[PDB]
Design a protein around this ligand. Sequence first.
Ligand SMILES: NS(=O)(=O)c1cc2c(cc1Cl)N[C@H]([C@H]1C[C@H]3C=C[C@@H]1C3)NS2(=O)=O
Ligand SMILES: NS(=O)(=O)c1cc2c(cc1Cl)N[C@H]([C@H]1C[C@H]3C=C[C@@H]1C3)NS2(=O)=O
Ligand SMILES: NS(=O)(=O)c1cc2c(cc1Cl)N[C@H]([C@H]1C[C@H]3C=C[C@@H]1C3)NS2(=O)=O
Ligand SMILES: NS(=O)(=O)c1cc2c(cc1Cl)N[C@H]([C@H]1C[C@H]3C=C[C@@H]1C3)NS2(=O)=O
Ligand SMILES: N[C@@H](CCC(=O)O)C(=O)O
Ligand SMILES: N[C@@H](CCC(=O)O)C(=O)O
Ligand SMILES: N[C@@H](CCC(=O)O)C(=O)O
Ligand SMILES: N[C@@H](CCC(=O)O)C(=O)O
Lengths: 260, 270, 270, 260
Amino acid sequence: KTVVVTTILESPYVMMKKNHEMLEGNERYEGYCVDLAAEIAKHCGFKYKLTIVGDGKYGARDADTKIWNGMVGELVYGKADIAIAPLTITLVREEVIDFSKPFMSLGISIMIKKVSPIESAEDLSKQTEIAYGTLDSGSTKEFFRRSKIAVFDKMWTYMRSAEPSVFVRTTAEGVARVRKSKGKYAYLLESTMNEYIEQRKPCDTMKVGGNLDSKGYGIATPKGSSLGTPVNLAVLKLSEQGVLDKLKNKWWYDKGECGA
Amino acid sequence: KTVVVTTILESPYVMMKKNHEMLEGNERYEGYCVDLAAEIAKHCGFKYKLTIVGDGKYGARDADTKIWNGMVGELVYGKADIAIAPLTITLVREEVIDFSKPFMSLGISIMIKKPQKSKPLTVERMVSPIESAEDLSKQTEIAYGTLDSGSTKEFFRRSKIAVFDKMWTYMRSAEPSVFVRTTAEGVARVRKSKGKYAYLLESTMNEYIEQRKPCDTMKVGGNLDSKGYGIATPKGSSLGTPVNLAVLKLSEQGVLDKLKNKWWYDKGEC
Amino acid sequence: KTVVVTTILESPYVMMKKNHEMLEGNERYEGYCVDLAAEIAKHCGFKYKLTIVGDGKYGARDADTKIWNGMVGELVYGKADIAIAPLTITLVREEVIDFSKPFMSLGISIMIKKPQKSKPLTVERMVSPIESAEDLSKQTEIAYGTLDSGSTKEFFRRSKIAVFDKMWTYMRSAEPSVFVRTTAEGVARVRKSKGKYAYLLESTMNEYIEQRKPCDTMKVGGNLDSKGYGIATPKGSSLGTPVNLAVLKLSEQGVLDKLKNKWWYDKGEC
Amino acid sequence: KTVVVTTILESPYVMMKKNHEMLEGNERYEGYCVDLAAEIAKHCGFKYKLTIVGDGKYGARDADTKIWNGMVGELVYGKADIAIAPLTITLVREEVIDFSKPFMSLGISIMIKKVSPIESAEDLSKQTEIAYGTLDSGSTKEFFRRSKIAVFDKMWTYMRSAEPSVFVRTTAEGVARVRKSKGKYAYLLESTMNEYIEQRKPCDTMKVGGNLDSKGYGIATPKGSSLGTPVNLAVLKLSEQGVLDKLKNKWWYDKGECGA
Ligand SMILES: NS(=O)(=O)c1cc2c(cc1Cl)N[C@H]([C@H]1C[C@H]3C=C[C@@H]1C3)NS2(=O)=O
Ligand SMILES: NS(=O)(=O)c1cc2c(cc1Cl)N[C@H]([C@H]1C[C@H]3C=C[C@@H]1C3)NS2(=O)=O
Ligand SMILES: NS(=O)(=O)c1cc2c(cc1Cl)N[C@H]([C@H]1C[C@H]3C=C[C@@H]1C3)NS2(=O)=O
Ligand SMILES: NS(=O)(=O)c1cc2c(cc1Cl)N[C@H]([C@H]1C[C@H]3C=C[C@@H]1C3)NS2(=O)=O
Ligand SMILES: N[C@@H](CCC(=O)O)C(=O)O
Ligand SMILES: N[C@@H](CCC(=O)O)C(=O)O
Ligand SMILES: N[C@@H](CCC(=O)O)C(=O)O
Ligand SMILES: N[C@@H](CCC(=O)O)C(=O)O
């Protein structure tokens, strides 16, 4: 029986290849996530099919609705069997569905135009001249929303009272807004995506400061599913063998079209 | 019913208080792990008593006997309820026990003696003989070893990478043995080897020891891999989910980071 | 019974919120003094409603007619219950009202326009024509004045010091008048006088204005004296002792320092 | 009727003159406090006599006894009519007796041997190599005892668990211990006393950092005394006329036997 998989067309995790207009099957996708899905299928021994959630969202909770959108929505409501995609792990999504062991560690990063006058996020909180935003229905905004730290509370109060809407539809739109703003707009995003933007043309954006926290990416599984343990063991096996690191290097630094 | 806690006397996770001879109960110990256990107890209501295993081993499967020892064995055989200690999540351990999400990131680093500054405007430059792991594998004059019954040794013995395979081959046939029995033993070997020995230990203890007096050691290279410290729980136990949720909540609240800077950098002078 | 609070719209003590047109109640105002009033209400249980006097004067005794105006007159005649505002403790005011312990230290400083840097290795040096008060008294090309119905003017008119007597003599017979009616008016006169005018205002507002955009003003010299901002209370009232104790408790707890840093330096770029 | 006044032999507030073995009356004392007392007596028009509390303490609350020592003890228990001395004003003493308006503003200062590696008190709290202490039965230790700030709580926990007893009998003993310790002992003391030590021989000590708080000195009066208002008005009048500042300069910088 073919197993349906939900994901999001995020680079370098998933790509559309180049001649996507004349490609079909599981060979029409290239990237970290599709290769990981193929490896998981080979290890478990099941046929898998890749699908993309119609809305370009990861998943969140609507106001006064209690409905899951994004990939977790497809997982919970019977529209998917496993989500192999860069889905951050937090407390809220852990209650509804179970996560495997993380396969990529990261944190909150600040990206800005190419010394930096803000450096630490403390100055950025204390300096309102440069704006800052996040991605809607992700995990960074959820982290900032319910943070009891004074600095993070001030940041979140800034985000909610922001004219116009500081949030963006996609991280590509976020970096586009950052580049077009000529350094007046900062982007709070995951470390991996920030570095990927940094190491590609035109190499105009750079990461500033350290990481505000520590997170990870997990392979979400429907609650009470028989496949959670096999895929968790497969993730651990890949981490032990270094296949995760090898694929990270393959899709991360093998090309390297920038001067670093 | 008060549950027991398995922990190892490892700095800065667990220390011994100065006035611990006259003190009993949970007041004997101090450090990162005791605060983590206190926060876990505050999150989910239960009574905890700190225990330290006699063998003082992290856990490994003995060959030709198939018997788990250390924390993993103590947890498997039902004589322990929780292991709030720097226990590394591995594939072999996940098959016997239940692991929550990692609460601390780590990597396999290298410990060597810090060289003296070279005299030859009036600035001092650092000279080192090791810059990565490939040169350590190629070079042979300085011996290198790992911790016995640890996660690093198990990772090295089951790695198909050429350089890691060469390191494992050297370690398994090195006379005298390059393996140590404790972290402090390895650090003492590094300090008293006069730069003739390299210790492969985790990055957290590495940086903690580097930042503390007499700060005569220094770490080289990056992390050989990426792993994390989890909280262990016996397979099919009712404490796994609440502990996992507590770890996630503590990570989100920033208490883990606060403990990290409290016990790692606030008490460092070098 | 809800008591009334007398305050002046002075920055950074009290500011007008951006969306105050559609907002009523205590939400209209923001700044140091509104937070001080909130902390006072939290300490001792009572209901407070912020009021701003129409005349907008601090308080002085009119000559030949003997009427107290401003906040002092408002509290003397019983139409107000408390004055949580930057009101200076003076000898003349203490004879008519009750003053608690000061909650902020201040001094009489000088406001002048900041000169441009001089071109003549590659460093920039600051040149100023005034370094103290004695040279200001000796020099006469640049006019200087104070605030009307303020504490500084009352201090100047009743000082036996020779230099201060000379300053008062110059001020009382200056054409056109060197006295301003508001702090903002004096700052505007300093900014638009092209360095031909000096303003004698308190050091707190002086440094707040200096630290804020467009940061085109700069303070010279030390404080002419030492005073403090108190909380006013009508003579023989039951609110004097609880307010004094609340001020002492807030000072001990460090809330006053936290408010000072929040509203004086955290919002400054120059 | 002669009014008795309690004080403490603290310099430059009160001196013993030089030929004290052959002096008597109110003319056997020189200094800021005796001159202030003479001015207050002249303004009010009453005969005053100066006395020193037998114990060299300002005043505090003993454990499980509720008895006032120091100068406030002499004031409360009918042994004095007014205390003209450098008595800091705080909440605890305000409840028992009333204080006039302050006549000298100051704060908590750190003194050390003659750039400084600690600078701010944050480093000193985070650096236990150099010890720090205060004066027993004063106001600095009371401020540190009941401070809810994390840094000040850490400092107070350090003071209580100090071997040997870090407290000193007198500020002169404190500066002696600081000088003999060769920079390994810091002294938390009032700004005025620290500066007075700074501006005298051998000019070996210097103040480090800013002020941890803001305080003041008041003329304590017995609770329910008819003299509180006249002396409060006299203090305000002296502050208005500049006599307080003039006496401060007279006993503070007129001599100036150091290189500044
Ligand atoms: N170097 S990296 O960010 O691509 C990365 C990060 C991580 C990896 C693997 C890689 Cl390649 N696996 C670990 C997992 C392996 C076992 C130990 C911790 C979890 C369970 N999580 S991690 O520390 O988040
Ligand atoms: N010790 S640390 O500051 O580097 C550190 C390391 C890690 C933290 C939190 C901290 Cl503070 N949380 C993550 C976990 C928390 C939740 C989000 C990812 C996993 C589940 N593991 S981690 O990546 O090992
Ligand atoms: N605005 S400030 O930080 O310089 C400042 C100034 C002063 C403060 C407290 C602060 Cl935070 N408290 C004192 C008062 C408080 C208690 C101790 C001395 C008097 C009674 N007045 S003050 O010397 O005018
Ligand atoms: N310059 S100083 O420290 O000797 C000093 C400090 C102060 C003085 C007078 C002097 Cl000389 N008087 C003021 C008082 C006068 C009136 C205004 C504030 C109080 C009531 N308190 S103060 O601000 O604590
Ligand atoms: N990649 C994150 C969202 C990124 C963001 O919100 O900044 C997630 O899957 O939740
Ligand atoms: N922390 C390691 C042991 C120490 C080491 O391997 O260096 C573990 O949990 O196995
Ligand atoms: N703050 C002063 C008025 C301002 C000034 O005099 O500069 C007072 O209370 O009288
Ligand atoms: N001079 C202070 C005490 C000094 C100190 O404790 O440091 C007082 O009168 O309370």
